[PDB]
Design an enzyme around this catalytic site. Structure first.
Site, PDB file in Angstrom:
ATOM      1  N   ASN A 171      44.372  33.725  44.452  1.00 29.77           N
ATOM      2  CA  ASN A 171      43.144  33.165  43.889  1.00 29.77           C
ATOM      3  C   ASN A 171      42.412  34.080  42.899  1.00 29.77           C
ATOM      4  O   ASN A 171      42.059  33.635  41.799  1.00 29.77           O
ATOM      5  CB  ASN A 171      42.180  32.709  44.994  1.00 29.77           C
ATOM      6  CG  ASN A 171      42.844  31.828  46.010  1.00 29.77           C
ATOM      7  OD1 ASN A 171      43.769  32.259  46.707  1.00 29.77           O
ATOM      8  ND2 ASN A 171      42.386  30.577  46.112  1.00 29.77           N
ATOM      9  N   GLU A 172      42.164  35.337  43.278  1.00 35.10           N
ATOM     10  CA  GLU A 172      41.474  36.248  42.357  1.00 35.10           C
ATOM     11  C   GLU A 172      42.374  36.619  41.181  1.00 35.10           C
ATOM     12  O   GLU A 172      41.907  36.756  40.052  1.00 35.10           O
ATOM     13  CB  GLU A 172      40.958  37.509  43.066  1.00 35.10           C
ATOM     14  CG  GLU A 172      40.150  37.250  44.347  1.00 35.10           C
ATOM     15  CD  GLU A 172      38.896  36.393  44.145  1.00 35.10           C
ATOM     16  OE1 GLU A 172      38.509  36.087  42.985  1.00 35.10           O
ATOM     17  OE2 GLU A 172      38.276  36.024  45.174  1.00 35.10           O
ATOM     18  N   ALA A 173      43.666  36.782  41.441  1.00 34.55           N
ATOM     19  CA  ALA A 173      44.622  37.017  40.363  1.00 34.55           C
ATOM     20  C   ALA A 173      44.628  35.856  39.349  1.00 34.55           C
ATOM     21  O   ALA A 173      44.754  36.070  38.139  1.00 34.55           O
ATOM     22  CB  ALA A 173      46.020  37.262  40.938  1.00 34.55           C
TER      23      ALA A 173
END
EC number: 3.2.2.22
Length: 278
Positions: A171-173
């Site tokens: 998700n953050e990637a």
């Protein structure tokens, strides 16, 4: 008020946890591309469509994480409007949810999906080991979950850690080129020693301020009132982002934000639909 279409994903992105760094980059880029509002880019970075007003979350995608090209994989249920992880499907077919009563037929995993829930504090992201084995282990722990397991402190803690690992590495990637590049940099061929590392304070601040960074870049696109020079990017020093160019290189995909003089929720969704978006 339960979510709709959770098991009717708009697309499915798949990654083999043993695959190359290049394939990881391709996988993340593909997620951004499929999430985009074709009618709305900022500095050549995709912007998500707005969240649909006055309906429950009805737009979802799946991420499948596999131990090998042939293996059945862990399925992640992620919102296609804000990239929030809300559910995952174990090998026995059980849907687990991170918000009680959100996903029809799902079983609550016993903790929430925010970093405060998972780590105690959003300030602790800099403690999270990232790397290929962390990914593999996270997949194993969540995929191997069964409805009939008796829970313990230790299993719950392992599960929180596995979710945290996937949040950062998927998700953050997806949200951040800084994070995706950092994770990609930790993935190596088998002939290289096993590797891991942790993000620094800049990426921690980025992860904690996705809406802020998205909003700050969106403001630069707003056409200036009669008489005015174009809006200038306002540095967010804690993120190490001082210019619009640095913001573009940092943002993987922007969260839609209504900014003064910018697109409204309704208008951006209108353009999304006109451009073939679902």
């Amino acid at each position: 008020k339960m979510a709709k279409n959770v098991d009717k994903p708009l697309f499915t992105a798949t990654f083999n946890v043993q695959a190359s760094s290049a394939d990881y980059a391709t996988f993340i880029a593909g997620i951004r591309n499929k999430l985009r509002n074709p009618a709305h880019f900022s500095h050549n970075r995709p912007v998500l469509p707005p969240v649909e007003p006055n309906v429950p979350p009805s737009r979802w995608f799946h991420v499948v994480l596999k131990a090998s090209p042939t293996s059945a994989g862990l399925t992640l249920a992620i919102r296609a409007d804000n990239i929030y992880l809300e559910g995952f499907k174990s090998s026995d077919g059980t849907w687990w949810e991170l918000t009680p009563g959100l996903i029809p037929g799902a079983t609550y995993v016993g903790f929430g999906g925010t970093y405060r829930d998972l780590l105690g504090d959003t300030d602790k992201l800099t403690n999270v080991a990232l790397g290929r084995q962390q990914l593999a282990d996270a997949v194993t722990a969540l995929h191997g979950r069964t409805k009939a397991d008796k829970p313990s402190g230790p299993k719950q803690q392992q599960a929180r850690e596995a979710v945290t690992t996937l949040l950062l590495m998927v998700n953050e990637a997806t949200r951040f080129q800084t994070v995706s590049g950092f994770v990609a940099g930790l993935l190596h061929p088998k002939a290289v020693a096993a590797a891991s590392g942790k993000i620094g304070n800049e990426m921690k601040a980025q992860v904690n301020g996705w809406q802020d960074l998205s909003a700050a870049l969106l403001k630069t696109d707003v056409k200036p009132p009669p008489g005015k020079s174009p809006a200038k990017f306002a540095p967010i020093e804690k993120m190490g982002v001082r210019t619009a160019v640095q913001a573009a290189n940092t943002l993987g995909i922007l969260l839609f934000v209504e900014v003064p003089g910018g697109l409204t929720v309704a208008k951006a969704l209108e353009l999304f639909h006109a451009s073939g978006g679902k």
